[PDB]
Amino acid sequence: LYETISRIKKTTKLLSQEMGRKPTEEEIATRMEMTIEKLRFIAKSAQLPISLETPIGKEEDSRLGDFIESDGETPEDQVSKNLLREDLEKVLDSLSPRERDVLRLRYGLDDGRMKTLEEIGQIFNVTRERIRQIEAKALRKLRHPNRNSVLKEYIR
Amino acid sequence: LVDDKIHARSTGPYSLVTQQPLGGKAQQGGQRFGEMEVWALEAFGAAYTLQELLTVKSDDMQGRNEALNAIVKGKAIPRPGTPESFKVLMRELQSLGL
Amino acid sequence: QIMHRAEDLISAASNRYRITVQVANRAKRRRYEEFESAEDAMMKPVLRAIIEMSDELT
Amino acid sequence: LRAIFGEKARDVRDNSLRVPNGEKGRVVDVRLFTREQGDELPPGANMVV
Amino acid sequence: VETFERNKTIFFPGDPAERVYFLLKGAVKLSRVYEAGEEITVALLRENSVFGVLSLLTGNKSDRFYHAVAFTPVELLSAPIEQVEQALKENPELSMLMLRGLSSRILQTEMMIETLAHRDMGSRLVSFLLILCRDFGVPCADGITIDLKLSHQAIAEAIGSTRVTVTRLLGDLREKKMISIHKKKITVHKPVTLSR
Amino acid sequence: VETFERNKTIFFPGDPAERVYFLLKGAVKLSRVYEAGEEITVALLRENSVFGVLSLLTGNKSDRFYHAVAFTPVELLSAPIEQVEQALKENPELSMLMLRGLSSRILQTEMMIETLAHRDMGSRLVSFLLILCRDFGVPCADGITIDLKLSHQAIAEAIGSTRVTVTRLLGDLREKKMISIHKKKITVHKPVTLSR
């Protein structure tokens, strides 16, 4: 890679012969037998990182990198999701607790996400059926739009 | 013109490093800040504003958020977090040989 | 008035801060105590706090 | 949730451009172009908007 | 063009299915709903009819209360209240088609409606199979072929059988080789046969 | 104005019920037919909808195959293919009203279709009367009055209850007070308790 980045265009520089300076265009790829996309792939991967601590500009109040965050949570969806997640079970209040207490969180939810169909088969009512039915029962004990009809704005 | 010279916002992305929000005079521009005033905000003290006034709008994640909630959660926004940037400063120092 | 003659109570009651602080102490709770939207507390929690201080502060 | 609220959407996302608030301005041109002219493009990047 | 497969959620509680579903193709069904539930092919659309049905009730926010999904990669439009809008206000161009829509889906079910109302469900199965499995493919294994591969619990979901109309009814049909587990051809050798 | 009492015979095998079958009024039903038979209120018309339904199929000689009769007088302002004819070709005037007419018979029918194939019926029956008996009269005694005097085993002539629910459901809700025969006033005091 660190040689293609310094050869793909080098060649072209000379390969420019029979062409107009920067020879052809994606024929370059073909010239070196490659696919543009990989080319950009290589083109993109060149030069170097910027300082990220260099003056913003002619002025000061400026080393770069005074200068981003990726992620916190955008306070907005941390006060959201908790409400949502918590409510996903906090509004689980339109059913008898035979399912409300178990299938509540599918086979996981809040969990890494799992302890499953078997387990409940035993873990709760020595079932293997009753999982799917009472779960489906509750799986509908919330959908006809009136069941748990306090979080319809969810539209999610 | 007040248009390009307007400015005011309620939190948003903090930084990376300090992870503090950041005012480069943008739509989410730090209400900028002046310690010359934190050198005039103690003349009456009563921490609280200060206490907040750093914390939870600077370091504490769970503070800041704590807030968000408290109000929309009908809760008495608590008690500082503890700052952390502090801890950040402490970290490099500990490595520097602290 | 809404808030004006309150410049004396704090002014003449030993440690002023201190006052405040209690006053909050009222505040916090004397919102807190009732989260039933009692319109008494429809206004800000302090200002009551204050005043019923005030007019007990005779 | 996805499957629970009752629908299976997908996160193909879109941070498409939302002009800032108070932008009561009629739009008045555009210069714009993609791969084809050779996007004279900051590489790694597809098409000017 | 709007184009929907099976195992989905198409209508909901409350839907805005007004701006046209505009079904063009499937070989498939309106599952409906309401409260007691039964999202059953309480109508249908194959290829050759079109939605715009409760979508044309109080309209874009009626009490639109169904829910349907296919077993066919249903086919259905790329436009709003426009192609219909022609069809609605500016004439009867596709206005007669609008009425036809009901008479081509509602009334289509209307036939199955005076027939689904029978004692045994086998009838509804034979009727259903008389129109579908027979026609738009060739009556292969053991006659008027199931014209696809589905499941033996198909009846168990279509009508909502309880592992009862299954193996028992199947049994009968296994006895009269009007069945074909292989590629779910399951059928009488002749259309009239179980249609009596 | 076309105006039909209970009993008698209205559709036939083969009917020419075109030329405006304008059921303008009743509190009543389309009995239908075909071969297996069941001339059931496989639709309805009270006051406030109108025929013109399979009358507008292939039309004046379609395979028009029903048969309906009422439970009481049934008014029908009527015209030639004229009042409709306006309504059909010259615009959507009562083609705009016709789309509503298409839904008209269908609605209440498809709603009763939403009910109809529930398993056991006293239910859907309750739903049916919840529409009739409650609304367009007043409860009187026992609550949501049968809004008329009718048949004891309504089920007998309704779904066709031979000897099941024909008098059993009657007892099931008799002691329950949710039903009681007095001047045919026969109701829940509260449809809800039976609307479940």
Swiss-Prot record, chain A:
Q: What is this protein's gene name? A: sigA
Region of interest (Sigma-70 factor domain-3), residue spans: 3-78
Quote the DNA-binding region ranges, renumbered to this chain.
117-136
**Protein's name according to its UniProt entry:** RNA polymerase sigma factor SigA
Source organism per entry reads: Nostoc sp. (strain PCC 7120 / SAG 25.82 / UTEX 2576)
UniProt region (Sigma-70 factor domain-4), positions on chain: 91-144
Its subunit composition reads: Interacts transiently with the RNA polymerase catalytic core.
Its function, per the record, reads: Sigma factors are initiation factors that promote the attachment of RNA polymerase to specific initiation sites and are then released. This sigma factor is the primary sigma factor during exponential growth.
Where, subcellularly, is it found? Answer: Cytoplasm
The family classification in the record reads:
Belongs to the sigma-70 factor family. RpoD/SigA subfamily.
Which part of the full protein is shown? Answer: 235 to 390 of 390
From Swiss-Prot, chain C:
Q: Which reaction equations make up its catalytic activity?
A: RNA(n) + a ribonucleoside 5'-triphosphate = RNA(n+1) + diphosphate
Record's GO cellular component terms: DNA-directed RNA polymerase complex
Mark the transmembrane ranges.
Answer: none
Can you cite a GO biological process for this protein?
A: DNA-templated transcription
Keyword entries, A-Z: DNA-directed RNA polymerase, Nucleotidyltransferase, Transcription, Transferase
| EC number(s) stated in the UniProt entry for this protein | 2.7.7.6
MF terms per GO, please? DNA binding; DNA-directed RNA polymerase activity
Q: Organism's domain of life? A: Bacteria
Subunit structure of this chain's protein = In cyanobacteria the RNAP catalytic core is composed of 2 alpha, 1 beta, 1 beta', 1 gamma and 1 omega subunit. When a sigma factor is associated with the core the holoenzyme is formed, which can initiate transcription.
The UniProt similarity line reads: Belongs to the RNA polymerase subunit omega family.
Physiological role: Promotes RNA polymerase assembly. Latches the N- and C-terminal regions of the beta' subunit thereby facilitating its interaction with the beta and alpha subunits.
Q: What is this protein called?
A: DNA-directed RNA polymerase subunit omega
Tell me the organism: Nostoc sp. (strain PCC 7120 / SAG 25.82 / UTEX 2576)
Swiss-Prot record, chain D:
Q: What does this protein do?
A: DNA-dependent RNA polymerase catalyzes the transcription of DNA into RNA using the four ribonucleoside triphosphates as substrates.
**Subunit text:** In cyanobacteria the RNAP catalytic core is composed of 2 alpha, 1 beta, 1 beta', 1 gamma and 1 omega subunit. When a sigma factor is associated with the core the holoenzyme is formed, which can initiate transcription.
> Which family does the record claim for this protein?
Belongs to the RNA polymerase beta chain family.
Q: What is this protein called?
A: DNA-directed RNA polymerase subunit beta
Q: Corresponding gene?
A: rpoB
Q: Shown portion of the whole protein? A: 788 to 836 of 1131
UniProtKB/Swiss-Prot annotation, chains E, F:
Q: Name one Pfam family in it.
A: HTH_Crp_2
- Domain of life assignment: Bacteria
Question: Which InterPro entries does the UniProt record give?
Answer: cNMP-bd_dom (IPR000595), cNMP-bd_dom_sf (IPR018490), Env_Response_Regulators (IPR050397), HTH_CRP (IPR012318), RmlC-like_jellyroll (IPR014710), Tscrpt_reg_HTH_Crp-type_CS (IPR018335), Tscrpt_reg_NtcA (IPR022299), WH-like_DNA-bd_sf (IPR036388)
Locate the HTH crp-type domain: which residues?
119-192
| Keyword flag DNA-binding | yes
Q: Give Gene Ontology CC terms.
A: cytosol
- Which Gene Ontology MF annotations are present? DNA binding; DNA-binding transcription factor activity
Q: Which UniProt keywords are listed? A: Activator, DNA-binding, Transcription, Transcription regulation
Q: Name the DNA-binding stretches.
A: 152-171
Q: What does this protein do?
A: Required for full expression of proteins subject to ammonium repression. Transcriptional activator of genes subject to nitrogen control. Has affinity for the xisA upstream region. Binds to a 66 bp region containing three repeats of the consensus recognition sequence 5'-ACATT-3'.
Question: Any idea what this protein is called?
Answer: Global nitrogen regulator
Origin organism of this chain?
A: Nostoc sp. (strain PCC 7120 / SAG 25.82 / UTEX 2576)
